Design an enzyme around this catalytic site. Structure first.
Site, PDB file in Angstrom:
ATOM      1  N   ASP A 117       5.936 121.956  -2.477  1.00 45.75           N
ATOM      2  CA  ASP A 117       6.820 121.798  -1.302  1.00 45.75           C
ATOM      3  C   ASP A 117       7.516 120.460  -1.263  1.00 45.75           C
ATOM      4  O   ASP A 117       7.002 119.443  -0.820  1.00 45.75           O
ATOM      5  CB  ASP A 117       5.926 121.988  -0.073  1.00 45.75           C
ATOM      6  N   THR A 118       8.771 120.426  -1.712  1.00 41.83           N
ATOM      7  CA  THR A 118       9.516 119.176  -1.752  1.00 41.83           C
ATOM      8  C   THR A 118       9.853 118.650  -0.345  1.00 41.83           C
ATOM      9  O   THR A 118      10.183 117.473  -0.214  1.00 41.83           O
ATOM     10  CB  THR A 118      10.826 119.337  -2.544  1.00 41.83           C
ATOM     11  N   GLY A 119       9.786 119.512   0.672  1.00 43.06           N
ATOM     12  CA  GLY A 119      10.058 119.067   2.058  1.00 43.06           C
ATOM     13  C   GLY A 119       8.852 118.459   2.736  1.00 43.06           C
ATOM     14  O   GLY A 119       8.978 118.052   3.902  1.00 43.06           O
TER      15      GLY A 119
END
Ligand SMILES: CC(C)CN(C[C@@H](O)[C@H](Cc1ccccc1)NC(=O)O[C@H]1C[C@H]2CO[C@H]3O[C@@H]1C[C@@H]23)S(=O)(=O)c1ccc2nc(NC(C)C)oc2c1
Ligand SMILES: [Cl-]
Ligand SMILES: [Cl-]
Ligand code: NA
Lengths: 99, 99
Positions: B25-27
């Protein structure tokens, strides 16, 4: 580009003629942007995040530029804490995760 | 590998001797795992997302194996609806976003 993750992957988006900052978010299925005006009809949607669920407005077939790449697709509008570009538009700009 | 984003980017992780599925999850700034025991000291923390905040336990210096790559870092444990591998560990396995 190749974006590393030592900082938040923030990019400029352009929607409705306006520049905004948004987070490229592989953990988001859909794209969610802070309250703004969009044309056309909307439909209801409930989305569940880390803190529980919220109601947003779903606008389909919206023109949006992401980091200079053109996309046309669904944008959810509601009280998100940060503008998020989710997989529905990350796929439109050709993004992949690599390691 | 190159992971496309047509579907959620789920991988197998090993943490605390247990195998789990988690979202790359890059967020997510930090890594957040569903309730489980981990050894060592911890301190409380609040983290916020869509829907609002949850209380978590912060454990530092925890080793996780992510898709076969070992990393060490802080892991937050609490009532998240999905296991999330956030940027603090994605950087350690050399993950990037590419388009
Ligand atoms: C909204 C983002 C800015 C941040 N989130 C990461 C997202 O990728 C989440 C991950 C997550 C969490 C819970 C359930 C599913 C995924 N996506 C999300 O809410 O998508 C949901 C909301 C919308 C977005 O598109 C669809 O995906 C689901 C439902 C629709 S987060 O889970 O709230 C999250 C994770 C680690 C964090 N580390 C921190 N640290 C702070 C103190 C700096 O904050 C954190 C917040
Ligand atoms: Cl860390
Ligand atoms: Cl690097
Ligand atoms: Na520790």
């Amino acid at each position: 580009p190749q974006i590393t993750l030592w900082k938040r992957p923030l990019v400029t988006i352009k929607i409705g003629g306006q520049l905004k900052e948004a987070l490229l978010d592989t953990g988001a299925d859909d794209t969610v942007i802070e309250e703004m005006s969009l044309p056309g009809r909307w439909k209801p949607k409930m989305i569940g995040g880390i803190g529980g669920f919220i109601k947003v407005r779903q606008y389909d077939q919206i023109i949006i530029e992401i980091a200079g790449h053109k996309a046309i697709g669904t944008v959810l509008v509601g009280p998100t804490p940060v503008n998020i570009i989710g997989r529905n538009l990350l796929t439109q700009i050709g993004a992949t995760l690599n390691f």
